[PDB]
Amino acid sequence: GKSAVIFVERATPATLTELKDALSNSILSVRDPWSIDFRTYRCSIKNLSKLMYSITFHHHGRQTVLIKDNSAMVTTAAAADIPPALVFNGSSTGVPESIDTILSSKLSNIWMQRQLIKGDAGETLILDGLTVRLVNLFSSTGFKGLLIELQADEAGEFETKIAGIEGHLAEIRAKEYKTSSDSLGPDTSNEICDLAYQYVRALEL
Amino acid sequence: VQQLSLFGSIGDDGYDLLISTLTTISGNPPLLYNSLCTVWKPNPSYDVEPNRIKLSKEVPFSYLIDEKPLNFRILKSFESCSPWSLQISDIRSVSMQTIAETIILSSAGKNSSVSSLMNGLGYVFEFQYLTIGVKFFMKHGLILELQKIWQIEEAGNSQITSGGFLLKAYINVSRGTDIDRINYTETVLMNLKKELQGYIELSVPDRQSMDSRVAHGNILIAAALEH
């Protein structure tokens, strides 16, 4: 376990800056803005979970993880992620698109997008043995809360890293928040899948 | 992407000849490749009114050859999921097809097999085939695939192309490209067609073939079954 997502509902757009300030003395480095998209899909089929979640991470390109019934599938349309072997042999045209574009245009008879919440202009703070990303979450009706994503280099130091952040949360008066460091399958091999799953759990999508 | 293509076949006897000729026309060597494809369709039990999904990847050759050295001649002697290309295609002297694609990199959780992931989306396994061939890179994005195809069925495998090879010549262009460019693209294919006349007949599969149950809406399989 090397990651966790904390969602702060009782907050204002400013809580993000207050948290970054409280953390600033420990900032080793600041990286590039990032964003994220949380899509919720409802299945049209007449019974036989009809909800599927789709998390698109924007970090020097996009990756989308689909989460349904405690399972995840990682997909991409980003050039740097395509296995070169797949292109050479013709399995791939080498010109992919998002699984969400696919879902909405080819499978809309089965899956309907019903919600899309976003986090734009997220920030990335590099601390010692800890990466912390912050982004304000927005919905159709506006600001929804603060999202904090933690990734530790060493799993053995993780509990210590999460408690430290939680401490900074108490000092800025962010009293109520939900933490998720859950793993998809207690086999824990896929980080991006557990991370996405953690966003789902933290946001109670 | 938009794919324009032509198909034709030859008996085993003309393989060396076609290989040599393609090497001369393209100026390049024949590059060995293979692909394993699984086709999926919406679960009929769910009744949804057909966009088939095709999953495709390369397999290491050592899984298809037994046991000196590996080359084009070899064709004469005939728990995360892995990465897969996922495609959905839909439909004129050439074949024109629109392809929607995304790449699957891995999975995780209780039901992470590619098969469970597809059932999760409302799809069921329909058909599976394997292609082994050589490809040539030509000018203007033109790509040639000379191959043999096998349907992998529960009760045994069968080479659909027994007795010969299927040739696929195609060019992929951006969706929404000018009518003039589409025309230009079709032109390059017709030029290859003429240039190869006498060697092999390049054409588009009929509709009876394109619709037969045995083809599963798949153009390549339809073309292989045609001749």
Instruction: Give the separation between CA B116 and CA A86, rounded to whole angstroms.
Output: 22
Q: Across the strands, what pairs with B132?
A: B34, B148
Residue with tokens 């149950």: B213
Question: How is residue B86 written in tokens?
Answer: 């996922």
CA distance A112 to chain B (A): 12
Question: How is residue A156 written in tokens?
Answer: 């053995």
Residue B160 backbone phi and psi in degrees, to 5: -65, -35
Question: How is residue A14 written in tokens?
Answer: 């400013």
Q: How far is CA B68 from CA A37, A81, B61, B65, in A?
A: 53, 35, 14, 11
A96 neighbors B87 (Cβ within 8 angstroms): no
Residue of A nearest to B118 (CA): A73
Q: Are residues B105 and A45, on separate chains, in Cβ contact within 8 Å?
A: no
Instruction: Give the separation between CA B84 and CA B86, rounded to whole angstroms.
Output: 6
Report the candidate in A118, A124, A120 with the shortest Cα–Cα distance to residue A100. Answer: A118
Instruction: Give the separation between CA A182 and CA A75, rounded to whole angstroms.
Output: 21
Residue of B nearest to A49 (CA): B120
Q: Are residues B111 and A44, on separate chains, in Cβ contact within 8 Å?
A: no
List the domain boundaries for chain B.
1-227
Q: What is the CA radius of gyration of chain B?
A: 18
Instruction: Give the separation between CA B85 and CA A103, rounded to whole angstroms.
Output: 15
Instruction: Give the separation between CA A10 and CA A175, rounded to whole angstroms.
Output: 8
Report helix, strand or coil for A99. helix
Q: Which helix (H) or strand (E) holds B167?
A: strand B164-173
Experimental approach was X-ray
| CB pairs < 8 Å spanning A and B | 149
Tell me the residue length of chain B: 227
Instruction: Give the separation between CA A14 and CA B132, rounded to whole angstroms.
Output: 59
CA distance B197 to chain A (A): 26
Q: What is the largest CA-CA distance in chain B?
A: 56
Residue with tokens 């890293």: A161
Q: Are residues A83 and B109, on separate chains, in Cβ contact within 8 Å?
A: no
Residue with tokens 């009760």: B155
Report the candidate in A185, A201, A96, A66 with the shortest Cα–Cα distance to residue B122. Answer: A66
Report the candidate in A176, A5, A88, A162 with the shortest Cα–Cα distance to residue B143. Answer: A88
Instruction: Give the separation between CA A94 and CA A9, rounded to whole angstroms.
Output: 41
Instruction: Give the separation between CA B19 and CA B165, rounded to whole angstroms.
Output: 11
Report helix, strand or coil for B112. coil
Residue with tokens 């799993």: A155
The partner residue sitting opposite A102, judged by closest CB among B37, B45, B88, is: B88
Instruction: Give the separation between CA A52 and CA A75, rounded to whole angstroms.
Output: 15
Question: How is residue B96 written in tokens?
Answer: 């024109």
Q: Angle at Cα A36 formed by Cα A30 and Cα A37, nearest 5°?
A: 170
Instruction: Give the separation between CA A39 and CA A55, rounded to whole angstroms.
Output: 6
Question: How is residue B185 written in tokens?
Answer: 């693209």
Pairing, β B53-57 against β A51-58:
unpaired
Report the candidate in A24, A31, A34 with the shortest Cα–Cα distance to residue A119. Answer: A34
Instruction: Give the separation between CA B111 and CA A53, rounded to whole angstroms.
Output: 16
Question: How is residue A64 written in tokens?
Answer: 């989308």
Instruction: Give the separation between CA A148 and CA B183, rounded to whole angstroms.
Output: 52
Task: Determine whether B180 is exposed, middle or buried from the number of CB atoms within 10 Å of its CB (0-12, 13-18, 19+).
Answer: exposed
Residue of B nearest to A186 (CA): B109
The partner residue sitting opposite B85, judged by closest CB among A71, A86, A111, is: A86
Q: Are residues B110 and A70, on separate chains, in Cβ contact within 8 Å?
A: yes
Give the CATH architecture of domain B1-227.
Answer: Beta Barrel (2.40)
A24 CB-near residues (< 8 Å, 6+ apart):
none
CA distance B76 to chain A (A): 20
B141 CB-near residues (< 8 Å, 6+ apart):
B171, B172, B173
Q: What is the CA radius of gyration of chain A?
A: 18
Instruction: Give the separation between CA A6 and CA B60, rounded to whole angstroms.
Output: 42
Report the candidate in B23, B84, B12 with the shortest Cα–Cα distance to residue A85. Answer: B84
Check the CA dihedral B8-B215-B151-B119 and report its sign.
positive
Residue B111 backbone phi and psi in degrees, to 5: -115, 75
Report helix, strand or coil for A108. coil
Q: Angle at Cα B18 formed by Cα B13 and Cα B23, nearest 5°?
A: 145
Query: Which residue type sits at B47?
Result: D
The partner residue sitting opposite A110, judged by closest CB among B48, B87, B100, is: B48
Instruction: Give the separation between CA B196 and CA A147, rounded to whole angstroms.
Output: 61
Report the candidate in A69, A72, A70, A71 with the shortest Cα–Cα distance to residue A49. Answer: A69
Resolution (A): 2.4
- Which domains are seen in chain A, by residue range? 1-34+120-205 (3.30.310.180), 35-119 (2.20.140.20)
- On the CB side of B100, CA atoms within 13 Å amount to 17
Q: Angle at Cα A91 formed by Cα A187 and Cα B87, nearest 5°?
A: 80
Q: Which of residues 41-70 of B touch A (CB under 8 A)?
A: 42, 45-46, 48-49, 51, 56-58
The partner residue sitting opposite A68, judged by closest CB among B1, B35, B120, is: B120
Q: Which helix (H) or strand (E) holds A192?
A: helix A191-203
Q: Are residues A184 and B108, on separate chains, in Cβ contact within 8 Å?
A: yes
Q: Angle at Cα A126 formed by Cα A167 and Cα A165, nearest 5°?
A: 10
Q: Across the strands, what pairs with A30?
A: A125
Check the CA dihedral A100-A105-A109-A113 and report its sign.
positive
How far does Cα B208 stand from its chain's mean position? 19
Q: At what angle do helices A158-171 and A15-23 cross, to 10 degrees?
A: 120
Residue with tokens 């927005």: A138
Region of B27 please: left (phi>0), alpha (psi -120 to 50) or beta. Answer: left
**Looking at residue A104, what DSSP letter applies?**
H
